[PDB]
Ligand SMILES: C[C@]12CC[C@@H]3c4ccc(O)cc4CC[C@H]3[C@@H]1CC[C@@H]2O
Ligand SMILES: C[C@]12CC[C@@H]3c4ccc(O)cc4CC[C@H]3[C@@H]1CC[C@@H]2O
């Protein structure tokens with residue numbers, strides 16, 4: 168049976184999965200879970216995913232509750248022989264390492280900031296603290312790009328799909344003007360056909376955050 | 387060349403790698419990085435791992451900066467064909483899924499709490515807030531174990547090694563009285579010879595945290611056997 172993706176396109180890790188789906192022409196049934204209405208706490212979705220998070224994928228009996236597993240699963244099932252999830256062990260571990268950076272560091276800091284806005288209101292958030300934490304992530308990615316065109320080497324991989332959606336989201340608030348490699352990489356990502364899958368949810372997130380946070384992003 | 391592990395055994399994700407190294411009898415060189423002295427900000431270690439975190443593995447030219455990548459790499463290289471990182475695709479995805487739960491949810495909440503203690507002192511932490519967040523993680527692990535014997539299926543996998551070290555750390559502070567599947571599973575993990583690699587760093591972390599945060603963990607909380 169075809170995969171079912173539970174999603175809210177305001178979520179960057181959702182948008183990474185949407186980008187992979189578009190890149191690989193995957194036939195997926197979409198089911199919208201409105202996070203800002205708390206639908207991720209509805210009894211049946213909670214039973215499916217106790218972490219009450221999107222993206223969640225149901226593919227037959229397999230239930231995945233993390234975008235990075237979903238990216239790897241879909242690449243392994245629908246892109247055997249591709250370069251997104253490379254077959255050679257060392258290259259694959261490098262992609263995996265950067266997927267985990269996205270999970271552990273970049274998204275953690277993005278989510279910490281966005282959560283603070285939703286909970287406290289933008290006027291009551293320590294923006295300087297979060298600017299420091301998120302600029303530290305920019306600095307790391309700029310170094311990651313020193314000897315490669317893409318995040319994990321010379322070719323586009325799953326790591327780029329995972330990072331670019333969160334990066335585009337952090338970049339709602341914090342510009343890339345000071346980071347030449349990161350800005351060039353982001354511009355190149357924006358040229359890919361599959362990047363169109365990021366656009367609608369980024370803008371919906373912008374609009375939702377500004378309304379819920381009572382502020383305007385600088386951009 | 388033999389793998390090199392940059393480590394501070396007080397870190398639960400370090401201890402997960404130590405457990406796998408013991409379980410598989412991998413010969414690894416250990417290089418200590420004292421996180422409470424800020425040695426992870428030394429210029430050469432920062433150049434190696436810009437995230438200034440342990441564990442960090444150097445294996446030949448490969449540099450891994452996340453425990454979950456280290457566990458998977460070492461299982462592929464030293465448990466080839468084995469069941470810790472299982473061969474069938476769906477079983478492997480389940481293990482990967484719970485490795486990411488550890489990274490995204492359980493460890494995130496453990497480190498939010500531990501960092502707050504170190505940065506603020508225990509007396510100035512909103513302990514009730516962190517109790518709610520960490521009990522929520524207990525509830526989720528209890529749900530996974532209501533439907534499966536181990537975290538990711540019927541046998542020991544990398545997911546159990548990743549999760550048990552952080553669970554043992556959270557349980558320094560928060561009791562498991564209300565979580566019978568978690569207690570049964572944790573007890574079984576404690577019977578494994580490989581669990582001996584968790585014990586020393588767990589106790590060092592307890593000692594360090596009590597000192598730096600000026601508090602005592604409730605001795606009654608930790609599951610011991
Ligand atoms: C604010 C929430 C936590 C942080 C989530 C987040 C975190 C990071 C991000 O880039 C986008 C979002 C959108 C949905 C947000 C969630 C909607 C309700 C929930 O509490
Ligand atoms: C407190 C730090 C962040 C949280 C880290 C942590 C986070 C979770 C945990 O179980 C153990 C530790 C030990 C090292 C801690 C770090 C040493 C200094 C750093 O600031």
Ligand SMILES: N[C@@H](CCC(=O)N[C@@H](CS)C(=O)NCC(=O)O)C(=O)O
Nearest residue numbers: 178180219220221222233234235490
């Ligand atoms: N590591 C997870 C993070 C998933 C996550 O945190 N999703 C957020 C949206 S960006 C969510 O669903 N929040 C709802 C909630 O926590 O209640 C992944 O990569 O899928």
Ligand SMILES: N[C@@H](CCC(=O)N[C@@H](CS)C(=O)NCC(=O)O)C(=O)O
Nearest residue numbers: 271397399438439440441452453454
């Ligand atoms: N997701 C990473 C988490 C690594 C991590 O945060 N390690 C902590 C210790 S538990 C660390 O090294 N903190 C030092 C610092 O941030 O400066 C992994 O699994 O390896």
